[PDB]
Amino acid sequence: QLRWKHHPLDNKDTFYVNLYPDYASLSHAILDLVQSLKWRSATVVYDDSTGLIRLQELIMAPSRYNIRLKIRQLPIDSDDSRPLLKEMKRGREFRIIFDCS
Amino acid sequence: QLRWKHHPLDNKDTFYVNLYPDYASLSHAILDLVQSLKWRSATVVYDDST
């Protein structure tokens, strides 16, 4: 395998490898980032549920530290988040994380 | 089908159903509850990535 796929422990497969790295390590690197930034505020850019799935570690990450986070969605097939840009303009947020194509 | 499974948009098939209630409508019914309850904060007990 190359990318991410879901592999529950309920499946007990043997003969498979993946070439994707560890998302929880990615989340830990983002933790190291934002705590080096000392931010108590962050903002998620996503479009899919799947990116949220793969980065749900960062969703549970404010257990160790008080930080308010905003997680709102791109246009799914159209490509104009300038309404969402004006949304975050009223959202007044500047500490923004990006994952998309 | 009965269970929810993921059906993406680029999943562009034609021959499928599921009797499953839609997550947004479920979530918004929960919103109706909480807006009937006027809550400032919340806490989810949940299973997994689903």
Coordinates of C-alpha atoms in Angstrom, one line a residue:
Chain A
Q1 CA 0.0 0.0 0.0
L2 CA 1.0 3.6 -0.6
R3 CA -1.6 6.0 1.0
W4 CA -3.8 5.7 4.0
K5 CA -6.5 3.1 4.4
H6 CA -8.5 2.1 7.4
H7 CA -7.3 -1.0 9.1
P8 CA -9.3 -2.0 12.2
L9 CA -8.0 -4.6 14.6
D10 CA -11.3 -6.4 13.9
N11 CA -9.7 -7.3 10.6
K12 CA -6.8 -9.6 11.4
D13 CA -4.9 -9.4 8.1
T14 CA -1.3 -10.7 7.7
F15 CA 0.0 -10.1 4.2
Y16 CA 0.1 -6.4 3.5
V17 CA 2.5 -3.5 3.9
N18 CA 1.9 0.2 3.6
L19 CA 4.2 3.0 2.5
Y20 CA 2.3 5.7 4.3
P21 CA 3.9 7.2 7.4
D22 CA 2.3 7.6 10.8
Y23 CA -0.4 10.2 11.1
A24 CA -0.2 10.3 14.9
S25 CA 3.5 11.2 14.4
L26 CA 2.3 13.9 12.0
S27 CA -0.1 15.1 14.8
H28 CA 2.7 15.1 17.3
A29 CA 4.8 17.2 14.9
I30 CA 1.9 19.6 14.6
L31 CA 1.8 19.6 18.4
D32 CA 5.5 20.4 18.5
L33 CA 4.8 23.1 16.0
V34 CA 1.9 24.8 17.8
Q35 CA 3.4 24.5 21.3
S36 CA 6.6 26.0 19.8
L37 CA 4.2 28.7 18.6
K38 CA 2.7 28.6 22.1
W39 CA -0.7 29.1 20.5
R40 CA -4.0 28.6 22.4
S41 CA -5.8 28.9 19.1
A42 CA -5.8 27.0 15.8
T43 CA -7.9 26.5 12.6
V44 CA -8.4 23.4 10.4
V45 CA -8.8 23.6 6.7
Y46 CA -10.3 20.4 5.3
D47 CA -12.8 19.4 2.7
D48 CA -13.4 15.6 3.3
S49 CA -14.3 13.5 6.3
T50 CA -11.3 11.3 5.4
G51 CA -8.7 14.0 6.2
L52 CA -10.4 14.5 9.5
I53 CA -10.3 10.7 10.1
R54 CA -6.6 10.6 9.4
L55 CA -6.0 13.6 11.6
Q56 CA -8.4 12.8 14.4
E57 CA -5.3 12.5 16.6
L58 CA -5.1 16.3 16.3
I59 CA -8.8 16.5 17.0
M60 CA -8.3 14.8 20.4
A61 CA -4.9 16.6 21.0
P62 CA -6.4 19.5 23.1
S63 CA -6.6 17.0 26.0
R64 CA -3.0 17.9 26.9
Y65 CA -3.4 21.6 26.3
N66 CA -6.2 24.2 26.3
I67 CA -6.6 25.4 22.7
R68 CA -9.8 26.4 20.9
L69 CA -9.9 25.0 17.3
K70 CA -12.0 25.7 14.3
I71 CA -12.7 22.8 11.9
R72 CA -14.8 24.0 8.9
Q73 CA -15.1 22.7 5.3
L74 CA -14.2 23.7 1.8
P75 CA -16.7 23.5 -1.1
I76 CA -16.8 19.9 -2.0
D77 CA -17.0 20.1 -5.8
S78 CA -17.0 23.8 -6.5
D79 CA -13.7 25.5 -5.7
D80 CA -14.7 28.8 -4.1
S81 CA -14.0 29.1 -0.3
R82 CA -14.0 32.9 -0.6
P83 CA -17.3 32.7 1.2
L84 CA -15.5 30.6 3.8
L85 CA -12.8 33.2 3.7
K86 CA -15.3 35.9 4.6
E87 CA -16.6 33.5 7.2
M88 CA -13.2 33.1 8.8
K89 CA -12.8 36.9 8.5
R90 CA -15.7 37.2 10.8
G91 CA -14.2 34.2 12.6
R92 CA -11.1 36.5 13.1
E93 CA -8.8 33.6 12.9
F94 CA -5.2 33.7 11.7
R95 CA -3.6 30.5 13.0
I96 CA -4.6 28.1 10.2
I97 CA -3.7 24.6 9.3
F98 CA -4.0 23.3 5.8
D99 CA -4.6 19.9 4.3
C100 CA -6.2 19.5 0.8
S101 CA -5.1 18.6 -2.6
Chain B
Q1 CA -28.0 -2.4 2.8
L2 CA -28.7 -1.5 6.4
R3 CA -25.4 -0.4 7.9
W4 CA -23.8 2.8 7.1
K5 CA -20.7 2.5 5.0
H6 CA -18.9 5.3 3.3
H7 CA -20.3 6.5 0.0
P8 CA -18.1 9.3 -1.5
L9 CA -19.0 11.6 -4.3
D10 CA -16.3 10.2 -6.7
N11 CA -17.8 7.0 -5.8
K12 CA -20.1 7.4 -8.8
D13 CA -22.0 4.2 -8.9
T14 CA -25.7 3.8 -9.7
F15 CA -26.9 0.5 -8.2
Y16 CA -27.1 0.8 -4.4
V17 CA -29.4 1.7 -1.6
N18 CA -29.2 1.9 2.2
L19 CA -32.0 2.5 4.7
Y20 CA -29.6 4.4 6.9
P21 CA -30.6 7.7 8.4
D22 CA -28.4 10.6 7.2
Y23 CA -25.7 11.8 9.6
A24 CA -26.4 15.5 9.0
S25 CA -30.1 15.1 9.8
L26 CA -29.2 13.1 12.9
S27 CA -26.7 15.7 13.9
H28 CA -29.2 18.5 13.3
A29 CA -31.8 16.6 15.4
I30 CA -29.1 16.6 18.1
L31 CA -28.8 20.3 17.5
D32 CA -32.5 20.6 18.0
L33 CA -32.1 18.8 21.3
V34 CA -29.2 20.9 22.5
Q35 CA -30.9 24.1 21.4
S36 CA -33.8 22.9 23.4
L37 CA -31.3 22.4 26.2
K38 CA -29.4 25.7 25.8
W39 CA -26.0 24.2 26.5
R40 CA -22.7 26.1 26.5
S41 CA -20.5 23.1 26.2
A42 CA -20.5 19.4 25.3
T43 CA -18.6 16.1 25.6
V44 CA -18.9 13.2 23.2
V45 CA -18.7 9.5 24.1
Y46 CA -17.9 7.8 20.9
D47 CA -16.5 4.6 19.4
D48 CA -14.0 5.1 16.7
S49 CA -13.1 7.0 13.5
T50 CA -16.7 6.5 12.3

